[PDB]
């Protein structure tokens, strides 16, 4: 069921320092 | 003057409710009976000028969304006729009179008199606070001001007072036709947390009491009769229910109309029979 009557913010996810779309050589 | 009870509730509730929630001392008196946990949590949420959360009020079947965390909901309810009068007559007046007002004013120094000035024409005076004008004072009204004589009242050039008066419109004397209406209106608080609802209902009961002293209530809306329903789930099709205790308010008021008279007799001639 969708949350409309009560709404909580998106969860705080622990971020990773890895850069996305990283090129390697 | 058809009375829209629903509008009156909103007009009284919105300012007074904000004032009550503004301070903490009054809330403690209101919530004296409740336990510590519920009392302070409500106070932490809504009470105080620095409250992030706020209460709202509105009528039923709105096309938008209401703050279901805490909200007052009103719906008009039933109405009935209870008492009539002969010819449906209520009262007779020599002057077209509007609402009854309370205004504050300071005495002004004229030569023969001390006078108060008011925002509108005085029409019928009712009372000036704690003054019993004697005949030697010669209290009289003029336009938008009321005057009383100066002598043996000279300490009162700076007198600060409240005045109760009526709005005058016309000199057209007329009659009143109408009857009394017994009307019921429904009010309910809404929340997804039952404790908030109980606190919310109790707050409502207090301001209803305070409304018993209001000018409009004393003069127009009399004979309160309150009735409370059982706490029920207003909604069940959602992630969580909505709980609210409906209340029913009853009033007695007059549905009045003004009928104007033009047949003013001024001349009166006596003629004897020719025989």
């Amino acid at each position: 069921k969708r949350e409309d009557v009560i709404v909580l913010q998106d969860p705080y996810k622990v971020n990773d320092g890895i850069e996305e779309d990283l090129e390697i050589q | 003057a058809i009375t829209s009870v629903d509008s009156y509730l909103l007009s009284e509730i919105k300012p007074r409710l904000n004032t009550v929630l503004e301070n903490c001392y009054i809330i403690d008196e209101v919530l004296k009976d409740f336990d510590y946990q519920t009392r302070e949590s409500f106070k932490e949420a809504f009470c105080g000028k620095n409250a992030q959360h706020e209460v709202t009020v509105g009528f039923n079947f709105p096309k938008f969304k209401n703050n279901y965390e805490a909200h007052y909901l009103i719906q008009l309810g039933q109405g009935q006729e209870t008492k009539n009068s002969l010819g449906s007559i209520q009262s007779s007046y020599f002057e077209a009179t509007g609402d009854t007002l309370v205004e504050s004013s300071t005495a002004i120094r004229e030569d023969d008199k001390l006078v108060f000035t008011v925002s509108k024409p005085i029409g019928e005076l009712i009372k000036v606070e704690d003054i019993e004008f004697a005949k030697y004072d010669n209290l009289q009204v003029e336009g938008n001001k009321v005057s009383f004589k100066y002598q043996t009242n000279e300490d009162y050039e700076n007198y600060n007072a409240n005045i109760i008066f009526t709005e005058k419109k016309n000199d057209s004397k007329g009659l009143v036709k109408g009857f009394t209406v017994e009307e019921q209106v429904t009010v309910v608080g809404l929340s997804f947390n039952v404790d908030v609802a109980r606190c919310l209902d109790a707050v409502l009961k207090m301001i209803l009491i305070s409304m018993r002293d209001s000018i409009e209530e004393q003069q127009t809306f009399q004979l309160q009769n309150l009735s409370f329903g059982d706490i029920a789930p207003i909604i069940e099709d959602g992630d969580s229910m909505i709980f609210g205790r409906p209340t029913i308010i009853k009033y007695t008021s007059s549905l009045d109309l003004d009928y104007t008279i033009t047949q003013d007799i001024n001349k009166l001639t006596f003629k004897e029979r020719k025989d």
């Binding site: - | 008492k83 009068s85 002969l86 010819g87 007559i89 009262s91 007779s92 009659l175 004979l223």
Partner: protein
């Protein structure tokens, strides 16, 4: 349609007027008259040979809701003490709402008793009972 041949009076077709002033929020009024009829009984008859009028007593009552203004005390019609002795007689008129014609008028009305009730759950009411000299139904069409 409205055939006048069968119409009757009701609370919506009547006005109660004093000194030209229509009394406001008046609820009810009752009128009583007693001619004091008495029979004459001979020795040789159990039956009353005839009846005779002897004494005319009449009273009228009025019930009202006490308006904040123009109550019977404020109007000067009633009284609350020795002020009564300076109150003159009055005439109470019942007049038709439609035509403003008179239905019945009481002449030389005088006050008999005064009742007022203060109650918590109901609107304030007051009742007055008058004694009048004569009644009249003149000034008709």
């Amino acid at each position: 349609a409205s055939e006048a041949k069968q119409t009757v009076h009701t609370g919506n077709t009547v006005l109660l007027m004093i000194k030209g002033k229509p009394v406001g929020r008046a609820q009810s009024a009752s009128g009583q008259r007693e001619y004091g009829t008495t029979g004459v009984y001979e020795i040789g008859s159990i039956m009353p040979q005839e009846h005779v009028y002897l004494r005319y007593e009449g009273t009228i009552t009025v019930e009202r809701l006490r308006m904040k203004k123009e109550n019977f005390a404020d109007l000067g019609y009633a009284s609350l003490g020795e002020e009564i002795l300076k109150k003159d007689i009055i005439d109470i008129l019942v007049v038709d709402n439609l035509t403003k014609q008179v239905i019945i008028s009481y002449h030389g009305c005088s006050a008999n008793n005064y009742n007022e009730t203060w109650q918590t759950n109901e609107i304030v009411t007051e009742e007055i009972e008058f004694s009048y000299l004569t009644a009249s139904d003149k000034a008709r069409t």
